[PDB]
Amino acid sequence: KIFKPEELRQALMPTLEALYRQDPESLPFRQPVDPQLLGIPDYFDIVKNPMDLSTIKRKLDTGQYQEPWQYVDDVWLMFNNAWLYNRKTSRVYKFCSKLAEVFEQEIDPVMQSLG
């Protein structure tokens, strides 16, 4: 099936909006991890493919996703990066886990309607 950028954006943006609605949970995910301001030079060594809410939002806005599982994969890459890098006791780790809860709840009827 041919997935038009405008179609994917209309159907998938509400699932990302749900993630953005999460306070305090989305706050560290709204913008790309800055290893310079954070003082974590080992970040890009561990995280080969950084992902965040603004990058996923930009990819939807710019027609970078050709098919819906690519969007789902980037949302999971964002979750997997935070769980990989951060300690189990951190805010970011517990916050990531809450975003995973929300995403799972939102994405299912959406993926069921697209194919």
Ligand SMILES: COc1ccc(CCc2nc3cc(-c4c(C)noc4C)ccc3n2CCN2CCOCC2)cc1
């Ligand atoms: C609300 O939750 C927090 C969590 C941590 C901190 C300490 C600073 C901080 N520690 C961060 C770690 C990460 C991050 C992700 C996500 N994955 O690996 C690392 C590493 C990302 C951003 C981070 N930041 C800035 C967060 N601010 C929030 C206000 O809006 C602008 C962004 C402050 C607030």
